[PDB]
Paper text:
Crystal form A diffracted to 1.2 Å and had a unit cell of a = 72.71 b = 72.71 c = 52.33 Å and α = 90 β = 90 γ = 120° displaying a P3221 symmetry. Finally, a monomer of this structure was used as a template for molecular replacement to phase the high-resolution (1.2 Å) dataset of crystal form A, which was subsequently refined to a final Rcryst of 12.4% and an Rfree of 14.9%. First, the 1.2 Å structure reveals the spatial configuration of the (Sa)EctC protein ranging from amino acid Met-1 to Glu-115; hence, it lacks 22 amino acids at the carboxy-terminus of the authentic (Sa)EctC protein. Indeed, a similar dimer configuration to the one described for the “semi-closed” (Sa)EctC structure is observed with the same monomer-monomer interactions mediated by the two β-sheets. In the “open” (Sa)EctC structure, both proline residues are visible in the electron density; however, almost directly after Pro-110, the electron density is drastically diminished caused by the flexibility of the carboxy-terminus. In the “open” structure of the (Sa)EctC protein, this interaction does not occur since Glu-115 is rotated outwards. However, this electron density fits perfectly to a water molecule and not to an iron, and the water molecule was clearly visible after the refinement at this high resolution (1.2 Å) of the “open” (Sa)EctC structure.
Each of these enzymes catalyzes as their main activity the cyclization of N-γ-acetyl-L-2,4-diaminobutyric acid (N-γ-ADABA), the reaction product of the 2,4-diaminobutyrate acetyltransferase (EctA), to ectoine with the concomitant release of a water molecule. We demonstrate here for the first time that the ectoine synthase is a metal-dependent enzyme, with iron as the most likely physiologically relevant co-factor. The EctC protein forms a dimer in solution and our structural analysis identifies it as a member of the cupin superfamily. The two crystal structures that we report here for the (Sa)EctC protein (with resolutions of 1.2 Å and 2.0 Å, respectively), and data derived from extensive site-directed mutagenesis experiments targeting evolutionarily highly conserved residues within the extended EctC protein family, provide a first view into the architecture of the catalytic core of the ectoine synthase.
Numbering used by the authors:
A (entry chain A), B (entry chain A): 1 to 115
Write the structure that this text describes.
Amino acid sequence: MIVRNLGDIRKTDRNVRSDGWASARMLLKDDGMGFSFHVTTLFAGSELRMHYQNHLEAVLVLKGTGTIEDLATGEVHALRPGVMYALDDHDRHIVRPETDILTACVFNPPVTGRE
Amino acid sequence: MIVRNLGDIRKTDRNVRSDGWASARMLLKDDGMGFSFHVTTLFAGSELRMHYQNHLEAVLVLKGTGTIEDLATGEVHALRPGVMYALDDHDRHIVRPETDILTACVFNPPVTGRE
């Protein structure tokens, strides 16, 4: 069994920061689960479009509010606690946090942490 | 893109209840992501040992307190918000919620919802 704490991971190189977000990587490919599992903070005021190519991602909103806009349809979806979105390589999206947003994220295949 | 709300799913047959827990299945195998993604409530006072055979599971604690005991080692781990555990078929564990515990859970391969 693995048992790990977010607060511990946040104090390590498994916690990464970029422009507009930070993420604590709880599980990465080398943990062997066949998916990665992250606790990701999306900062207020960012306009985020990143997607790791050749991966699928699911995102559960834990805290905070904002929007996710689907550029394929023009749909603007509310983000708030309990909203989940799922993305592939073909999605064209923009995530815009109103407040900071805390999320639980899953990638398949797993993110490696080496980019 | 998929975008779905916990409150909506909870009102459907994707929300299942058993002895000691209930789960809203956000993503199942038929959603095509290659993992399932659940929001699971573990009830206060339960002593839970279930594991779906031939699956891997990761669990992030969102709310509540309790313990997870590893019968292979005798380790008793605290459950509280931000603790993540991961299990395979070989783990021998008991989860004992003190309060109700809310979790975000990932299974690989995905749960089907047909048992």
